Design a binder for this molecule. Structure first.
Ligand SMILES: O=C(CO)N[C@H]1[C@H]([C@H](O)[C@H](O)CO)O[C@@](O[C@H]2[C@@H](O)[C@@H](CO)O[C@@H](O[C@H]3[C@H](O)[C@@H](O)[C@@H](O)O[C@@H]3CO)[C@@H]2O)(C(=O)O)C[C@@H]1O
Ligand SMILES: O=C(CO)N[C@H]1[C@H]([C@H](O)[C@H](O)CO)O[C@@](O[C@H]2[C@@H](O)[C@@H](CO)O[C@@H](O[C@H]3[C@H](O)[C@@H](O)[C@@H](O)O[C@@H]3CO)[C@@H]2O)(C(=O)O)C[C@@H]1O
Ligand SMILES: O=C(CO)N[C@H]1[C@H]([C@H](O)[C@H](O)CO)O[C@@](O)(C(=O)O)C[C@@H]1O
Ligand SMILES: O=C(CO)N[C@H]1[C@H]([C@H](O)[C@H](O)CO)O[C@@](O)(C(=O)O)C[C@@H]1O
Lengths: 118, 118, 120, 119, 124
């Protein structure tokens, strides 16, 4: 199976964004975080972030930000692939999330979104 | 004829998108994939991907991604040029596709799309 | 708490935007500034800027600019994190403010915007 | 006159777009090409292209691509400046065009588009 | 005052746009130019341009271009800051403009635009 693709939430919408600059662990960073909803259904797995110079995958900062902004605009249904327990700066984790954003795929129906499933 | 332009599907719409980050073969990659339909019906040649650091043509990652996102937004009729049997990571090809995305051109009628045909 | 995240204004709208190029302190700069409203409420904390080659955080100029431009388009409610007393160029500070823009987050309700809320 | 601004078509609309990656003449390239509307015909005429690593002007690939995509989206009237007899890869010329895209300007009326004119 | 911010036109709309490539002085350049109107009126100062590798401020080509395109799309009211007598190739000036685009700011009402204004009637 694809490494780091085992943990996802499907058929969600990106209903909030954050983008900022921040000194973390003595380094200058950019970060963004997405906030999720699932229609009217309460979702607790509701925030995932990406940092330009930290994380399991530093690549794709701008492209992932632009992709997240796109789905915030459309309100379309997506699947979010993420990794738990990544961010080690405790101030950041408490403010935003511990989760790293890995991938965003679209859902064309209540069952199907692109990408691997477990 | 133009090398790598002999294999295409016409009058399709990009009805799904994936963008992600992924370690493949020891390298840190970005990828995106496009999902297709043929008007009202499915097409089983229905996914094609591009990878920033692997493939026959590594250039144009951002421009191809932006172009794919554009036609996902418009739902316009397009022709997709692609190359067979490119992606060799078995987990990636199982989840997404073996095909490398080469070009996207528009169709201005049910019988005409820009670019070369066989 | 997150350094430089203790000062913010919530549930505002970006109702004006400036982008330009400018020589400041002997250096060629780009800058942008956002202007804020909060409905019809009188606000005084109403402008914040980012400069490509000066500031506490020089990274993220383009991304912050495009983010600011997006919310100017939507008119949606946002929270603005900023830092006081950054820009020293007297002409620039007089035209805009001294404040450096640190982050922009969205507000999905009257009571929620993303990001930390703890203060000093 | 401005060099490479002598040849143009005015008050046209872009009705097709192509973007791809392609090996030409031993080099990896990106290209895009625009097609122009002719009456109610589906088939475009007067296609023009730009290539990232070849041409008289290699700069501005991404900006020109995004400009062309913009006017394809709006369908607005534009003036297109181009150069004839540029692309020499026979396969590319046959599939797309020999013309290199130089500039795109808007037309605010049937009688005015920005940029220089020739008589 | 802010250097290069003393000449501007306020409450205009960007109603035309040009982008192109051009060889000048042995350098390959990009440029763009904006055309302006003041509501239903034509104005005197109605065009200004930016060039990626010439001018008083070479930085910010892409960000200025994107910003100009945005306001051409929205048709919103803006203030344009510009500098006179920058482009001194007469065939470019005849074709497009002699003025260099310095900044674009918004006008949220007919009475307010963001950005510096001159000190007084004589710009002392
Ligand atoms: O074989 C390949 C491998 O690259 N490409 C050909 C491609 C594929 O065989 C199909 O897309 C697979 O479903 O088919 C091409 O020709 C198509 C195309 O012209 C489409 C346009 O809508 O029509 C397909 O014909 C339809 C037909 O019009 C329908 O009436 C009905 O008969 O079903 C067929 C199948 O959909 C043509 O087959 C293509 O360009 O997509 C040629 C490619 O060389
Ligand atoms: O205001 C602008 C807008 O572009 N630019 C000015 C720039 C910024 O205000 C700062 O870089 C933001 O952090 O400040 C310039 O001036 C500086 C510079 O002269 C340095 C020299 O070391 O001093 C900075 O002032 C120091 C001060 O001397 C110390 O006492 C210190 O502890 O406080 C300040 C910084 O807070 C001056 O601000 C610059 O060149 O960087 C001028 C720019 O025009
Ligand atoms: O399939 C993918 C997707 O990124 N990448 C594979 C990659 C591509 O399939 C190949 O490079 C494309 O030509 O092949 C590898 O053998 C390699 O070049 O190291 C392994 C790598 O995992
Ligand atoms: O036609 C194309 C399309 O990229 N490129 C050709 C390229 C262009 O036509 C030429 O560079 C345009 O000025 O000419 C070549 O002779 C070359 O410069 O090596 C061959 C190359 O295949």
């Amino acid at each position: 199976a694809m490494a780091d693709y085992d943990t996802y939430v499907s058929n969600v919408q990106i209903n909030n964004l954050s983008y900022g600059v921040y000194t973390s662990g003595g380094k200058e960073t950019q970060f963004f975080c997405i906030g999720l909803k699932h229609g009217s259904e309460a979702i607790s797995i509701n925030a995932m972030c990406k940092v330009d110079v930290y994380g399991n995958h530093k690549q794709g900062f701008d492209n992932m930000l632009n992709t997240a902004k796109y789905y915030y605009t459309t309100g379309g249904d997506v699947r979010i692939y993420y990794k738990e327990n990544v961010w080690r700066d405790p101030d950041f984790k408490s403010a935003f999330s511990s989760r790293e954003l890995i991938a965003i795929t679209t859902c064309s129906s209540s069952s199907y979104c692109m990408g691997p499933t477990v």
